């Protein structure tokens, strides 16, 4: 969806944000962080509740000295008696920045050019460029080696936003990335060409297989995302589960890498057990899945797992965007 | 309703708030704004969701250094197990100010005299004195001429709160105001007398016609508010729409003024098109209204429209009240 | 429930918190309060809406310079697609402290030892140790005499958390406390033994009667809590009301003390009249209760009533915990 924003950015532009995030994170850890958004007011306007990326946004903003007004579906009826267009045009005159998550990519653009101020196009939850920056910043941080030397793979539905995004990102940064999925769940091959271009001029190793052991070779990072269809009733998942349970990240797929240093990453949320309400619903129809779907309780509750460090890095990545767009240096 | 608070204020008192709002707005624009509510905590307690006047309040408070606890219907069950009386008496000992919007004008008064602290009687959303101050401050700002010289008219249901309020305000400030409505939708004539008193001693031109071209004469400002009854089902609006569609603000009513400088104002929200969910519902029964009701898409999406500047002025007006009542000078 | 945390604390530990609360309260009143939580971010994660203890927490945090992210049932779907375990482990890397109210005592413990940061086990609403500290701090403040010399009684269902807690607290601090209830609504006598131990070595007068005039003797404080079962339908309360209406706090029970200085305390909320929605429901079945249940409108709207001062003291008690656990001195 919104990875035509991630396509117009150069390796050098993306590297500027990864450096700002790396330094902002270091400043907070060493208590050298100067507030550059002191006295700025920011509206956080969400169509759906999404407490992980809300928090990431609030904490970025508060560390940088800003105030926040969260407006959730709970607290608003935006689009009911008053246009979203009208409400934005009022808030754009009161707030120094506004952040719209949900609502579709179409109207956010409309109320953006009017705006006398920054209007972030789904900077939160969205399989955003910010998600790719967090992931690359996470991998860069853990291997302590040049970005272009980093080896990673995505396992599951290569057609979904994390897969397309992690591949396009690999192609932009000159990294060694492998999409590993069923051959009928591969990106539409014209997309696979736009990535093959960037990769020649940036020198990225692209490699889209359907064989696990191929892709899992000497990778520093194994990635997956939820591949069950939450849109469709649980009753009809059988066919889907059959296609992808090969591509589950289990302890065996970690070992298959024969790199005892390898790390697992996951943008979250992650079906890895039955603690959740939807877990129970799934596992009641599908008792094989008591122990996880795209990834197992074994791997998730193991030291290979750095998804929480990676969720943290969304906060430093969001902050680096907010400071870039409102801090004046 | 709450314009018996707007009646006890003198021209000189109202002018003090309009000056504080004008200067506070200038300070924010030139970055000379000193925080006078530093370390104050304010509770914002709302019966209904109302994101435009909530935001206006939050931003006023944050620019002045204050903290805010928003309590919406979402986040509270005030009046369920615990009296509103009890909850207020606890919060009045923790917060430096409380703001009650909704709940009826009756009880807010009760828990106010107990209060060791300021308790604002519907300072938000309410067709408040603050709404009149914003509107007068908006007109004063755009004509750059003495208040008493300003010419404006309200078109639609002269009996509703904006109409009564814009007339009483005109009478207090010595302005040239015209209410223009059907003769059966005119204020109860004892109210029209209390305004005719103030106008003699302040020198205001009052003038309540039912003829558009009369009222729209050489006015600097054309005002309307929503006149459809949201209380009643859409099926039964026909009679109402027939009575008032004359009084719609369309491009022709702007031209009818023969002042190419004239501005349109609207307290919002405004049915001007079908973007809203209630828009669709109305326009499905009433396809003539695809393009707006009290005012047209033509005027609303035109440079005559300064309703958004006017919504902004509610934030500077709210701030001027908050600073007057809590800042200690 | 969570008074096995209140059992491991010594008289000298509890006295340290009561002193910090007393001094923090004095600092705010005299404007000498230094911010020790400047730049700290705190997550406030609530399963149920609970606006009195939310506010107490927010105000404690803002007076001490902290920021807050409130997450209510309104604004979250914690436990739906994402484990509470997972969400906590992400937020624990962004926030300096987290506060979990509701969710059961079991899992809060789980996600606590992981936590690189303070995780308060139901510091809000919970019949918490913080509730006991507020109550003791309230009584200490009003008698201006040594804690161990203070005389108080609880009237109603001695088996419920306030009763057990006010008794255990009395036993820890060496105070003169009386539980006064029906003999079949007395704590399980093994609990009554653990309290009788502490009381010997601290020198507390314990005394559990069923005779009002005995317990109400020369007490400085009369306490009660709601004893109707909100879990069960109103239709079936008759038997319960019959057992306890003896133990109602009415003007007569105040006089029965023959101390014209005596004060009434109540952790709130308090059924004292029909203003509430649940009031009406109760009083429609039970018209005798128009004027209150555990306590009367006569006492509640009288100067004997200091429940609001006591609710305030939850804010200074919460602050003393927050400053103890995050302020670094």
Numbering used by the authors:
A (entry chain A), B (entry chain A), C (entry chain A): 8 to 336
Give verbatim lines from the article.
Ornithine carbamoyltransferases (OTCs) are involved in the arginine deiminase (ADI) pathway and in arginine biosynthesis. Structural and biochemical analyses were employed to investigate the CP cooperativity and unidirectional function of two sequentially similar OTCs (32.4% identity) named Ps_cOTC and Ps_aOTC from Psychrobacter sp. PAMC 21119. Here, we determined the Ps_cOTC and Ps_aOTC structures from the psychrophilic bacteria Psychrobacter sp.
The cOTC is responsible for catalyzing the third step of the ADI pathway to catabolize citrulline into carbamoyl phosphate (CP), as well as ornithine, and displays CP cooperativity. As shown for other OTCs, the Ps_cOTC monomer consists of a CP binding domain (residues 1–152) and an ornithine binding domain (residues 153–313). The Ps_cOTC forms a concave and funnel-like active site located at the interface of the two domains. The CP binding site sits on the loop between S1 and H3, where the conserved STRTR motif is clearly defined. However, oligomerization with varying salt concentrations using SEC indicated that Ps_cOTC remained a trimer even at 1 M of NaCl; therefore, the dodecameric assembly could be a crystallization artifact. However, the corresponding 80s loop of Ps_cOTC protrudes into the CP binding site. Interestingly, the C-terminal regions of the 80s loops from the Ps_cOTC trimers were gathered to form a tight triangle at the center of the trimer with N81, which was not observed in Ps_aOTC.
